Design a protein around this ligand. Structure first.
Ligand SMILES: [Ca+2]
Ligand SMILES: [Ca+2]
Ligand SMILES: [Ca+2]
Ligand SMILES: [Ca+2]
Ligand SMILES: [Ca+2]
Ligand SMILES: [Ca+2]
Ligand SMILES: [Ca+2]
Ligand SMILES: [Ca+2]
Ligand SMILES: [Ca+2]
Ligand SMILES: [Ca+2]
Ligand SMILES: [Ca+2]
Ligand SMILES: [Ca+2]
Ligand SMILES: [Ca+2]
Ligand SMILES: [Ca+2]
Lengths: 205, 205
């Protein structure tokens, strides 16, 4: 099933995952971290690693969590095998390069956070109340049939805050409740060229 | 065989290559440039494109020439299908992200130029005298069996200048003459952990 360690590993410390959702916190690591198969999750406290100093998500859909002031994980060959970029943590903030990720997530944050170079058919899922305006800017917004999939996904009432979607024509919102007891989510949308808004889900908005 | 256009295209202007080595100069392009098959070459005058605003090298081994103050082409999804990164031009200079390229080239430059995040088995070929110290820093220099392949390749005597290869243990230099008439190349190497230097080729060093 996997193992999760809530404490940030030593910069000197090697970690090896297996099948199943393993989950750790890394700092400026000096060692070659492997995550194995299954849907894994590494949270980084610093954007670039050290010495050398790598982390491979391995097979499966793996989440990389940026607890940092900006990221560009696609550029760094130190990170590989990740599919989802989540911006969440007490230091999580600022401009984040979405390039090369197939999904996006957002949690509690230190301040306003921006996703750049977001490819087509890439959706954002918000999982907890962030701080400050969340801007999404697509790889190419210029067309007139631009579709974005926003998801809100929580057990309790979620105050998603402001998300800005400049140049998107159809905005799809899923409001998702993870438990059996009903709630109502809240969102400021700023989508000045949206012609359609479609809401799906099983919670209020 | 291909076509080559030495003038920089209009930012509004669409270009389509075929098979064979086509070759152009781009600025902050607004359009979707395709290069087709064969070994193509785009020179860019500005690091990020515009509007949107893309250039795909297509099939084959294609060169991207950075006539700019720094690059990170791997990060930008606007560029794709390139295999070789060359730093050459009257504005070419500064820090350049080698990530995702399988070969490197260097020509005449505006000033000191640095290749970062250079993967293993990636070699540099210098084609003309650059300006200022050329630093190569590898993706991972930390091991004790590090091999780098430097090539010097010119018709006439080539003053390669200073190249710095911190953390490389075996430095291989090819000194290559492209014509039948003999010459002697010059190089300052700064390789403070090299145990071996091997020189091959058909010109003097
Ligand atoms: Ca695993
Ligand atoms: Ca995995
Ligand atoms: Ca994977
Ligand atoms: Ca990556
Ligand atoms: Ca609920
Ligand atoms: Ca649009
Ligand atoms: Ca819009
Ligand atoms: Ca071509
Ligand atoms: Ca090509
Ligand atoms: Ca590329
Ligand atoms: Ca190609
Ligand atoms: Ca000669
Ligand atoms: Ca070394
Ligand atoms: Ca050395």
């Amino acid at each position: 099933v996997g193992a999760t360690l809530g404490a940030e590993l030593a910069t000197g410390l090697v970690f090896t995952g297996g099948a199943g959702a393993d989950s750790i916190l890394l700092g400026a690591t000096t060692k070659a971290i492997v995550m194995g198969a299954g849907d894994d999750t590494v949270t980084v406290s610093s954007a670039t690693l050290g010495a050398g100093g790598s982390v491979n998500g391995g097979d499966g859909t793996d989440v990389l969590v940026a607890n940092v002031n900006g990221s560009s994980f696609s550029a760094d060959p130190a990170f590989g095998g990740f599919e989802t970029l989540r911006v969440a943590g007490a230091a999580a903030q600022g401009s984040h390069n979405a390039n090369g990720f197939t999904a996006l997530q957002l949690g509690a944050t230190a301040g306003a956070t921006t996703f750049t170079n977001v490819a087509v058919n890439v959706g954002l899922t918000v999982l907890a109340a962030p701080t400050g305006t969340t801007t999404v800017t697509l790889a190419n917004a210029t067309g007139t049939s631009d579709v974005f999939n926003l998801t809100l996904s929580s057990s309790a009432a979620l105050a998603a805050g402001t998300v800005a979607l400049a140049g998107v024509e159809t905005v799809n919102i899923a409001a998702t409740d993870t438990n059996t007891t009903a709630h109502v989510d809240t969102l400021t949308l700023q989508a000045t060229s949206a012609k359609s808004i479609v809401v799906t889900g099983n919670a209020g908005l």
